[PDB]
Design a protein around this nucleic acid. Sequence first.
DNA 1: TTGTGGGAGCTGTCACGGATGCA
DNA 2: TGCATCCGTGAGTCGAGGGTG
RNA 3: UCACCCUCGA
Lengths: 448, 148, 224, 195, 96, 93, 98, 97, 48, 145
Amino acid sequence: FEWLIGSPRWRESAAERGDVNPVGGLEEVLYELSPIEDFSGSMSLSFSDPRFDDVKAPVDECKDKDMTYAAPLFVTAEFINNNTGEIKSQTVFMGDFPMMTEKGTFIINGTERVVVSQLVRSPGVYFDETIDKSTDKTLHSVKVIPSRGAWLEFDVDKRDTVGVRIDRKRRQPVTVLLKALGWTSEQIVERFGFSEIMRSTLEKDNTVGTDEALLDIYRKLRPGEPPTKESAQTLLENLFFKEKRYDLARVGRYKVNKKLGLHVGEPITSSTLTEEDVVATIEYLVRLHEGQTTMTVPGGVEVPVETDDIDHFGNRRLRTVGELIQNQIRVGMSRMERVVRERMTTQDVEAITPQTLINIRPVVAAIKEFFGTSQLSQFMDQNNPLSGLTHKRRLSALGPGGLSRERAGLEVRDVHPSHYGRMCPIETPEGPNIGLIGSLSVYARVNP
Amino acid sequence: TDEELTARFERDAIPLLDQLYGGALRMTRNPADAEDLLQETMVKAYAGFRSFRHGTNLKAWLYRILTNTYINSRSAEVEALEALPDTEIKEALQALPEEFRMAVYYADVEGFPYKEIAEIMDTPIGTVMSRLHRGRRQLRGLLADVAR
Amino acid sequence: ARSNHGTCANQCPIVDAGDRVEAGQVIADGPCTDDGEMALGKNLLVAIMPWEGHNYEDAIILSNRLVEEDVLTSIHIEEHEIDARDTKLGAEEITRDIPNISDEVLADLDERGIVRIGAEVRDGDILVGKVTPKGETELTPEERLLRAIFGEKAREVRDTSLKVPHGESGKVIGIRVFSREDEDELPAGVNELVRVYVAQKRKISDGDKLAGRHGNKGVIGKIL
Amino acid sequence: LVDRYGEYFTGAMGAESIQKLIENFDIDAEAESLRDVIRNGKGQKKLRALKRLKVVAAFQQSGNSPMGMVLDAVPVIPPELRPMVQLDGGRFATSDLNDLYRRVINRNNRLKRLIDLGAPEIIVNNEKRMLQESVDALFDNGRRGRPVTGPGNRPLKSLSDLLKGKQGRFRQNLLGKRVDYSGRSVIVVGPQLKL
Amino acid sequence: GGLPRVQELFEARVPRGKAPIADVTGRVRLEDGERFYKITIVPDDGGEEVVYDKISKRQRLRVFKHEDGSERVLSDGDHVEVGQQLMEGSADPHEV
Amino acid sequence: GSTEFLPGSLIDRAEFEAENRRVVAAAGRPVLMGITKASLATDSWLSAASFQETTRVLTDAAINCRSDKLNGLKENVIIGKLIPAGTGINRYR
Amino acid sequence: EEVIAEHPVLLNRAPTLHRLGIQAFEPMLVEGKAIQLHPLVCEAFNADFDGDQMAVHLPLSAEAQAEARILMLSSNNILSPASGRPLAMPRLDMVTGL
Amino acid sequence: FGEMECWAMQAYGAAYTLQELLTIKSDDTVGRVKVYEAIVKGENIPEPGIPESFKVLLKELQSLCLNVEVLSSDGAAIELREGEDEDLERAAANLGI
Amino acid sequence: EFIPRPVKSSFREGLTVLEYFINTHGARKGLADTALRTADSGYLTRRL
Amino acid sequence: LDVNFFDELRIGLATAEDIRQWSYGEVKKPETINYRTLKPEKDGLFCEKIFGPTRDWECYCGKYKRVRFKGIICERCGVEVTRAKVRRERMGHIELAAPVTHIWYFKGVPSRLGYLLDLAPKDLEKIIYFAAYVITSVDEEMRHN
DNA sequence: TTGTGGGAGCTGTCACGGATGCA
DNA sequence: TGCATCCGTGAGTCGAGGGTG
RNA sequence: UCACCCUCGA
Ligand SMILES: [Mg+2]
Ligand SMILES: [Zn+2]
């Protein structure tokens, strides 16, 4: 929570960490949202500084009057009109932000509550070996899962092929995507030449070309509407490489740059898919059938080729309370950005202010909906001090963004060897939540 | 040229229904309500399509129409004991003369009009109302419980 | 103070006037703390042997001392809530005036119709008196006799008063009340809202669940 | 085909056309042809004709017209069986049946308004499709396409969901029920007792 | 095995072992082949031959092949009854 | 053959033979079927509808215009009638 | 104490795996708020006293009371209807004593 | 009293207990008050009626365009609801008509 | 599968950290398996 | 009163004649109740005229409140004066501008219509949801002329 | 009834019988 | 027009407490 | 009372 706010306790901590670049969670949502540009590019609106006024009511008064322990949230919204070149700063009230107590809990509508750390798979590429097709033949699959955006999936069939299953759509041959990103047959045949499965898929290819690959990817993405190459290029470039609709996590960029070793020279400047990492993922997928230990991308570095464990605590992270609140705030603020863009047209210029563009109703609704109805916001369990203490340290695998309850198999619940010193193997429910709720270990701490 | 205007409507704004359906679902989070809202916007647009000005970019008019139309939008124990009589109001009524008891019953319990009570009891209006008020008084004197 | 699950959370000072405390020391104990350490139970003298079948199949035999000396006694607070609001027939009223009710049962209620602090409540005792306007559609024929003969005009109501649930009894600790007549935030239509807190001292008893730290559970078969 | 050679046939879309194809349909001719195929033919087509005969012969008994498979009027369950109870703050909590019937009524009234207003056939076809889909959701939701989601994206309990599952009428309310004159409590051992 | 086998039997499903039984009494011809067995039964009456097409070497021959001959593992030329199982495994109850 | 049956359909042995008895005044083969399939194929549409796959059972039972004899135990449980077993048998009742 | 005399009740523990999971008993009034269960009928119910609870149903009609006294009486069902073996035999502590 | 409990009751062959549990204790609207009244006045327990949830099931099937009808022994569909005039006699008598 | 190293310590001597952590695997595996096993048995019993 | 002794229990498809024969009226409005007075809006989903009186022996407009009048219909409000117990057994109906298919018989596998008309469920999907047309009938005599 | 404008989440489930629909 | 593939169904019983829509 | 969800008990 001190990270989410940016409190000076969290400031000092960062210098010690060496992560010299300190950026709070709210500050991060502001930097992602800023600026807000109109379709004409004439006027921009950028949020700069988060600040907190003192708390509205003490904890005891909140619990007595059925209130929410909260503090007012202000931002510095600077608007710029490029046409008249004028600047209008301001201090805008975002909403009454629920605050965490000193005991680590929240007060929502007069009831004390705890936000359980959720167990979710970290972004990146994950390879698995699917035996048990119709025939005793090892088919290897890989999923590229981001922090936000559209998923990517590469599979191999019973018959030897390679295809891209994109957004649950039917699997189109991967050569379609290769030629859609600008590659030509003479160019891709080179890199995958040692793989005959790719050669067989190109021999079984339906069409060979760049613009027609764009248009066919388009018609695959687009039902019931006429195909066009221009909108094909726009949508295909906007879904993955554009930072708006696609969020590759910093954790995700780190995972993919460690797994594929493509860029290890500290290039964290941008978190997005690089055409080289898609080339690396496809080359990794096809070479995993052979399984040679050392693999070198055209730029990669001696990457070991092996399938990934889904339950390993290097590939399974946890979203703490700050990140969950940040992920609801992000959605609320994106809706507010929609409202801002809608206002920017109908309103009379030279009458607008950063106050008239901003509508804080969706953000307040998002926060209220989270703390009221979210599965991860749980009624605090206080029979004795110990019950609350562990409840605040629980790790829950169920919730939005993680696996559902019907997706919980025996293999996710078992004690993993990576749980040693991280999650306690003894403390867990006896009933249907067995293996789904586990207590954090004593000496363990959560990574940034 | 009314039907011709509707024909060029079928030829002009119909390609925009998909784009502005995306626009309506972009505000209404429920796709079914997005369908309903797009249908309402289309009824509004076709009702006043003749009023629409001819222009180079017609669709922005529909965009504003869409945004404006959206912004415009007892146990068995209790049941068994309820059946039993009060056996206090019962007794007090039994003490009343049957002639006055039936009168106060019809005019007070069942709430007939006085003429209709006179019709039921075969007796004229004077007899009915006299029995009515006299039985009222005798019953008032009979019970002082008044729900305690 | 009542906790979320009904367990009482008291706090008691463990220091005296004039003591020199270093930063980080425990000043006062919580509910299950003792001089700063977690104390979730009691140290009992245990004998490991089958005794006349009363401890058969995981049951537990207790010494009656644990009752007389309040060793396993615990305080359980429970909150009751009732609100008077506006109906279609009118507005509800929280009042001591309850029709067809003896003065003896109302004796523990103040002028407001709310129970008085410190009174002992039993199953069915009135915690908050509340009347609700009756539609008269379900009005009794023998009662319409009364309303028509005696000319009852002003008040036609029924008893919606809050009573104590079955099997629950205790001492009223506190009462808080919010009124629309005063400045308080209440949901729409809700005129008055009153909470009565009731605490009970539960001795250890047959059926209660005892367990150690080693996963050895059981109910109390008999307390000799 | 309608601009030229228009008067020579009849053809349409939606459920009206299915009602017509049922109207002009010979259950006896189709049934006799199918059982003739079963008797004479062999192979997978024999199995296909068997599966189709099992439907047609069942429809071939004592009236029981296939017209019942298309509704011109939808029955409404009594309001008690779809109750609506008050909440805190003037809000009201209702069943899902009421919202389903409400969507059906909304789309049907809008279709009437489109018919009277002479709207383009494309818009009227859209409204007819939406009416069909709403009746589908009311009868069995989630059976086709994504289920209709109330606020919170929960699937609305349809008329079929009331029967299905361990919590449906049959399992939950008919094969076993809650009874009067019953209690429960913690059990402790008494060795004192006779068997 | 275990509870899934009980369910497989009560649901009358075609078992996963798929151990075929004999269709008719008579002489047996055991074919040899890498990873695959083939069985050809010649009925003693002289009716049309019956052929069990292929069985993977993962399956193993039934232990009992004794009416007047060997009480050990089924070999070529043994005498087979009507219902004698031909492979070690789980028989199909529909065939039985 | 002569009687009115659908080939490949499963018919109770006693009812098949009895109908057969009426005839001549029919090539059946014993079939092993699972407990689920034997349960859904019962003569009581109410029992089958309460057991499993309620929607399909109700559709097919509406098409065939079936009439439940209210014979089995679970049917009497559903309609609240005294069950046809134990103390509910006409011999003892 | 008078109205209870010779009026049986039904004791049930979920899950009800066999018919012996519901058994009739003659109720004896007992001080406290817990149900006292005979130790020999545990094996039938698979009932222990580590925190288990059971439910009580009161038959009303003469036929229901007769079925409780005759068919479902505790001392009438001593044998497992599955194997015929007898449950309601001394369980573990009792044996140790013997 | 769940499904498996009814399985057990049937395995016992106790029919009247199962009917009483499922009709006059739970769903028989006219049988519940009848039973309470009979025990209060020290009389015998009457004969069970129809579970109301079965009527709810029939209405639910009718709402699914399924024409459900309860047939007599040899007759046609049987009327399943009751007239309102059954309750007036005893009330007018308790008021001393 | 079985782990090639056994737990040489009895619970009277007390297991080491590693032996306890290794035992947890089978313990929770069985605790979870029984939850599905009872459901399978119950469904089969209902069908019967 | 019923002795729960019924020989047989039959079902079958509901003809539109059956559906209208059952109904006591037609709901024309999406409205449920008037939120000011908490009263059923006429011709709504809770309408008292078609479904029944909310309160025992009362019409909507309030001109009839007594057990005296029973089995008659108020002329102003159009509500029969009777027990509210009928509100659980009185069905309404909805007249559809365009016919619809019962999703049980179309999407229920195997498709009952698809076997009835010998059509593929994919083509039936195209038809019922307005993706493609279908020829209902043709005049072969005039066409041949 | 103007000039602007491409959704939120998921899947980390398994086994089995049958109708669908592709090539 | 033979066969793979996709779709629909099913996945224990009975209790307690809380919140929000 | 209606529906969800959550955490528990055998
Ligand atoms: Mg136990
Ligand atoms: Zn009226």
